[PDB]
């Protein structure tokens, strides 16, 4: 609702994390934001169009963001809109996106099976809150999550370039997407617990591409014509099974996020004996 103002001057710019059409996202040094911290580290993200459509879509934005308050959504601390570029403060997530830290952590030490529960169950929570205020992601991916300190895990959304891989010509993260959302452009709360289906297999393939086999038109027809992707090793019986409940061909047949949430967080806290090694 109110934006909160932060002046240039208290934004020390320290490197480029990443950058894409919209224009850089850079590591900063913010001043006067957090009590009893002085300095502190935060992302900006840098839009290069100033442009009085582009000003009023940022406004926009920013006031939604201010919104979303959780323990499982990236922090938006604010803007700074002093001229061009208008920047986007938020904190600062040490370790990066949650799909280069599930392939930087995996078996090319390892995370193990407690550890995955926990990452699952973090994003499990963050979409019960956006499925409450009735938000749709639309582009709920590994890619998109982020990890902080202490293995926290959190949704947020880069709107860059690394993951063009990703996307397919409006770009449609199509790998992601129920066939609803495929055929008819149709995204609600149902194509987002499919996203989520997608997420767990990311999980516990530790970050690999759902159909990395396929082209994305291979992939269309596999997700269209009700193919399945296949349990990870690493996936216990009892994970695939929310999964599968995530992937019901109809948006009414597939399970609620809170209940999705509640099983993982179950197991979680009490982890099946399963070795991936023994399938
Ligand atoms: C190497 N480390 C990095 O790259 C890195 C480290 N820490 C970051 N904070 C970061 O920021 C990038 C990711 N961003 C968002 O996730 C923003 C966001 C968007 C929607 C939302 O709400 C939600 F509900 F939709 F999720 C909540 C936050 C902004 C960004 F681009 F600056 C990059
Ligand atoms: O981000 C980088 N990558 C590779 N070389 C360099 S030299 C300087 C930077 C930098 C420093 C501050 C803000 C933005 C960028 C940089």
Redesign the pocket.
């Known amino acids: 609702a109110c934006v909160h103002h932060i002046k240039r001057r208290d934004i020390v710019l320290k490197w480029e ?2 950058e894409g059409a919209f224009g850089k ?1 850079f590591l900063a040094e913010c001043h006067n934001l957090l009590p009893e911290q002085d300095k502190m580290l935060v ?1 900006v ?1 840098a839009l290069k169009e100033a442009s009085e459509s582009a000003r009023q879509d940022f406004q926009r934005e920013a006031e939604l ?1 201010t919104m ?1 308050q959780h323990q499982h ?2 922090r ?1 601390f604010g803007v700074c809109t002093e001229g061009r570029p208008l920047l986007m403060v ?4 040490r370790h ?2 949650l799909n280069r830290f599930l392939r930087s952590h995996g078996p090319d030490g390892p995370l193990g099976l407690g550890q995955l529960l926990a990452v699952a169950s973090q994003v499990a929570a963050g979409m019960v809150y ?1 499925a409450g205020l009735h ?1 749709v ?1 639309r582009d709920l991916a590994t890619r998109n999550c ?1 990890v902080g300190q202490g293995l926290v895990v959190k ?5 860059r370039d690394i993951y063009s891989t990703d996307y397919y010509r409006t770009m449609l993260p199509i790998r992601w997407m129920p066939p609803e959302s495929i055929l008819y452009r149709k995204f609600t709360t149902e194509s987002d617990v499919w996203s989520f289906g997608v997420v767990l297999w990311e999980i516990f393939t530790y970050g690999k591409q759902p159909w990395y086999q396929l082209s994305n038109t291979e992939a269309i027809d596999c997700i269209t014509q009700g193919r399945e992707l296949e349990r990870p090793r690493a996936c216990p019986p009892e994970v695939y099974a929310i999964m599968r409940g995530c992937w019901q061909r109809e948006p009414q047949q597939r399970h609620s996020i809170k209940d999705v949430h509640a099983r993982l967080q179950a197991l979680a806290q009490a982890p099946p004996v399963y070795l991936d090694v023994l399938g």
């Not at 938020?90 to 997530?93: L, Q, R, S, T, V």
């Not at 949704?155 to 709107?159: A, L, S, V």
């Open positions: 994390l990443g996202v992302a993200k963001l979303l959504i990236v938006f938020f904190e600062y997530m990066g996106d956006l938000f992601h982020l949704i947020g959304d880069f709107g």
